[PDB]
Swiss-Prot record, chain A:
It is found in: Cell inner membrane. This is Cation efflux system protein CusA. It comes from Escherichia coli (strain K12). Part of a cation efflux system that mediates resistance to copper and silver. Induction: Transcriptionally regulated by CusR in response to copper and silver ions. The chain holds residues 194 to 244 of 1047 of the full protein. The lineage of its organism: Bacteria, Pseudomonadati, Pseudomonadota, Gammaproteobacteria, Enterobacterales.
Length: 51, 50
């Protein structure tokens, strides 16, 4: 009923679910003396994140 | 004499290998993690020239 109310399909739900449980950072910048690795969060940890 | 021979036995340590030398050497310094890519080349050139 709530899927029809807001007008959303199951494919969209699956795509948004499988695209929010990752963690990837692929850079490294030099602060004039040493390297600094760039990391980005995104994992699903608690129920507040699923919601 | 067989008894007197007990003096050096306890005065000599036990070692697994001798150090066998080769005609070459390998220099390896203990360092720290943080390092860039240009400073590494600079340090390498300095150590080689020294």
């Amino acid at each position: 009923q709530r899927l029809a109310q807001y007008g959303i399909s199951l494919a969209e739900v699956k795509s948004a679910l499988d695209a929010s449980n990752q963690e990837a950072g692929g850079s490294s910048i030099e602060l004039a003396e040493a390297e600094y690795m760039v990391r980005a969060s995104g994992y699903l940890q608690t129920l507040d994140d699923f919601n | 004499s067989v008894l007197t021979v007990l003096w050096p036995l306890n005065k000599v340590g036990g070692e697994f290998l001798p150090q066998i030398n080769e005609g070459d050497l390998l220099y390896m310094p203990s360092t720290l993690p943080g390092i860039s890519a240009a400073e590494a080349a600079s340090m390498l050139q300095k150590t080689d020239k020294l």
